[PDB]
Design a protein around this ligand. Structure first.
Ligand SMILES: CC(C)(C)c1cc(CC2(N)COC2)no1
Length: 330
């Protein structure tokens, strides 16, 4: 089997991407944030504290004839930005782009933090990291991908995110019309539960390529590109007037600037992030200071190849017995 679904930026800046997901019987369609950096499928629901729901579409398990309470199971998650959610768990039928999993753990939110409430466009998350990160207790649950894997034509999914445009998540097959040249595959470590790999280096604009190992994770659920301070300093040094601002919380630059591209290495291959991809617009409405799409990972503990990097490529998440990652230009 295979699945194929369009993913759409939630706003003009590509701050996140949402993908329609069918849950339950009859189908209830929610727009979820596909996140290769976590491993819980959780949704706004009829159980979510009323004051914490503001415009989201909710899952109502009592209206699904295939929903079953997973007795005694609870979940609680906190993300890198300080946001959080928690609740209980149902199993139900979940379909993505024509691909159906029965008995999927659907984590129903009783509580969500303010940042989730404030984002009316995201009805929940669908985690695509490794199932070892799933927060369901006392019995850990599998991801949608993990559950689907045996039935898929090939044990893979691919991320094809658009720049200011829709893109595609495919399951079970590689669309050879969706990229240019060849796909370069690279080793993955699952030891932290992430799609963790090692980039071979970087270049800034037309500058010379610096060969250097950069360990990080392929994370669709993170908007920006977070890299070592040395690397990030080298990038923003090429932009007149750019600077790190503690009050804003990262590198900003004059909105009148033309940003240089950023190249990252995948083995011997190179993925080029165009300058425009790195512009995340005025820090506040009407400001002439713009927020940068490449930021320091110094205060994170890990480097993160988020959407800024991933949208520049066709990305293969290969979930074979030994998982790997593939990158192609497009
Ligand atoms: C910023 C990173 C490290 C990617 C991240 C991921 C998360 C969510 C989890 N706690 C890890 O899987 C569940 N919180 O921070």
């Amino acid at each position: 089997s295979t699945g194929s679904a369009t993913t759409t930026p939630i706003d003009s800046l590509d701050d996140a991407y949402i993908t329609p997901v069918q849950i339950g019987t009859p189908a209830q369609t929610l727009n979820l944030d596909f996140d290769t950096g976590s491993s819980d499928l959780w949704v706004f629901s009829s159980e979510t504290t009323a004051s914490e729901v503001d415009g989201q579409t909710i899952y109502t398990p009592s209206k699904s004839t295939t929903a079953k309470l997973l007795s005694g199971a609870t979940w609680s998650i906190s993300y890198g930005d300080g946001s959080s959610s928690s609740g209980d768990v149902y199993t139900d039928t979940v379909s993505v782009g024509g691909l159906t999993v029965t008995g999927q753990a659907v984590e129903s939110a009783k509580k969500v933090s303010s940042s989730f409430t404030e984002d009316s466009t995201i009805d929940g998350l669908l985690g695509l990291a490794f199932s070892t990160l799933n927060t369901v207790s006392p019995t850990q649950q599998k991801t949608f991908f993990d559950n689907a894997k045996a039935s898929l034509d090939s044990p893979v999914f691919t991320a094809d995110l658009g720049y200011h445009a829709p893109g595609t998540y495919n399951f079970g097959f590689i669309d050879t019309t969706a990229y240019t040249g060849s796909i370069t595959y690279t080793a993955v470590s699952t030891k932290q539960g992430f799609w963790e790999w090692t980039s071979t280096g970087y270049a800034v604009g037309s500058g010379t390529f610096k060969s250097t190992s950069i360990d990080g994770i392929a994370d669709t659920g993170t908007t920006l590109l977070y890299l070592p301070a040395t690397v990030v300093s080298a990038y923003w040094a090429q932009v007149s007037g750019a600077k790190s601002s503690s009050s804003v919380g990262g590198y900003v630059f004059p909105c009148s600037a033309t940003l240089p591209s950023f190249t990252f290495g995948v083995g011997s291959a190179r993925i080029v992030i165009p300058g425009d991809y790195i512009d995340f617009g005025p820090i506040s409405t009407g400001s002439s200071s713009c927020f940068g799409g490449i930021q320091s990972s110094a205060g994170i503990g890990i480097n993160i190849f988020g959407d800024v990097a991933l949208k520049a490529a066709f990305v293969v998440f290969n979930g074979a017995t030994t998982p790997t990652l593939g990158f192609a230009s497009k």
